[PDB]
Design a protein around this ligand. Structure first.
Ligand SMILES: [Cl-]
Ligand SMILES: [Cl-]
Ligand SMILES: [Zn+2]
Ligand SMILES: [Zn+2]
Ligand SMILES: [Zn+2]
Ligand SMILES: [Zn+2]
Ligand SMILES: [Zn+2]
Ligand SMILES: [Zn+2]
Ligand SMILES: [Zn+2]
Lengths: 210, 205, 205
């Protein structure tokens, strides 16, 4: 009986020792888990144009502007040469309309217009305004987005080159256009004289950022 | 019996350890669920030694804190290029070419002092990179992008014919990455000679 | 013997706790190895309060879900620039300048007021920002990028001399970030006056 009690006491002391070892290991774990819980990269999110899908972070790229070939580079979208007819509308120095043959070269988010006319435009003053509304294109191109300027571009007048024949002589002017809305721009240019007169063989060259 | 008290005390400590273990298990299971553990990066994003970068083509873009336009130096290349009549001419003509490369835009300004014999009212004139002998060091600035190659593109031409100037808004098209052909009116019909050909155009590379 | 049973029971629970601890140590070691810990982000990527962004120059690019071209408003600046003859002229000439700033491109359309006295067959004409009257607020739009400044660039010029028009494909080059000089033929020799000078060029900013 004395040996029972004394032996059990030694066993208890050994158990105490094990419990303290577990106690210490618990504290080390608690410190380690506290440290892990403070990890800065935990909870990261990504704002457009960055995005995550199934743990893969990507840069979302507009193919008319940029692409990747390992590094971020310029546009991958195919260029187009659009060909259509556009009835331009004279105002402010003309009441007439003129049918323009238009080639629109769309490359990246730049669209360059090259236009020439058949027929003529009667003018009454030394300056005329000519309006280009997308609704007046004879057979609207499918890719309409390429003919609409960006919000940034729309905010300013932009240069337009014009040439035409008046009294069997060709005149040419550095002129300007401006968008009155996303679908409509108007150009203003000298007519090469005063009074009622006719100009023909009108060419318009300009370009826009889309 | 003194032993019984010691046993009762040990039980309480074991139970305390158990509770702390359960708390740790819950916290570690929470840590294992952390959404950011699974993260990788797709080009043009890349990671090296824990640093995540945007890899940038210096001909297109750069950083000055924010992502901005190209840092690559522009170049004004000057060289001669033999162009080849390929329809409406079987003649050739040596062009003096200035190529202004700025970012991924390359603008051509060409002129000639020679003569081109043409046989019809339209001529096709071909520009193959192989016909540049004194090549510049960055020949990739003369190669259009895949996207740009997909369409015809505007070319202005001017020349003299029978002592008269002619100028036309004309078009070119790449038949391959190294070759484009311009198509333009010759200013008349039959066999004739045109002089002082100027060509102005540009490409996106 | 009774406390012997109780000691066996305590032993079993202590053992269970130790094994639970070993498993937690393995899981925590694994968590400590997590590759995504300590990720950082290099310009133009940045992080603020755990949100990772692409910092975008609004004159170059923007996002509309995807990374796209500039959002900044275009501007048509109008000002007077007094250009200075720096070879083949010691004269000055006042230019009316429209600068069309769209994204990081600035296109100049200039027309002259008055006559420029030239002395030779080529003139150099200098455009220093200090000579602009009523300097725009966004002066940054008139300063070429470091990349652009590295090369000469095309400039179109036209003017009148002795009642005849002349027009040349010419070139300019920046001597410093604030100053460029254009070089062009004057259409003759000796002392003369040219008028109605127009200049058209563009720069990447
Ligand atoms: Cl006992
Ligand atoms: Cl324990
Ligand atoms: Zn006129
Ligand atoms: Zn973690
Ligand atoms: Zn002709
Ligand atoms: Zn138990
Ligand atoms: Zn286990
Ligand atoms: Zn003077
Ligand atoms: Zn001349």
């Amino acid at each position: 009986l004395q040996t029972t009690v004394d032996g059990n006491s030694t066993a208890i002391s050994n158990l105490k020792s094990d419990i303290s070892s577990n106690g210490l290991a618990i504290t080390d774990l608690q410190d380690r888990v506290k440290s892990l819980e403070s990890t800065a990269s935990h909870g990261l999110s990504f704002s457009p144009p960055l995005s995550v899908a199934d743990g893969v972070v990507s840069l979302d790229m507009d193919p008319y502007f940029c692409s990747q070939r390992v590094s971020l580079t310029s546009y991958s979208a195919e260029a187009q040469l659009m060909q259509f007819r556009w009835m331009a509308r004279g105002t402010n120095g003309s009441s007439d309309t003129i049918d323009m043959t238009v080639n629109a070269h769309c490359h990246g988010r730049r669209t360059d217009y090259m236009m020439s006319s058949t027929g003529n435009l009667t003018v009454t003053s030394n300056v005329v305004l000519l309006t280009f509304d997308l609704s007046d294109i004879t057979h609207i191109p499918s890719d309409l987005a390429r003919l609409v300027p960006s919000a940034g571009f729309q905010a300013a007048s932009f240069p337009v080159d014009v040439s035409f024949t008046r009294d069997s002589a060709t005149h040419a002017y550095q002129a300007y256009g401006v968008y009155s809305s996303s679908r409509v721009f108007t150009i203003t240019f000298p007519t090469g004289g005063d009074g009622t007169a006719n100009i023909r063989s009108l060419t318009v060259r300009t370009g826009i950022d889309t």
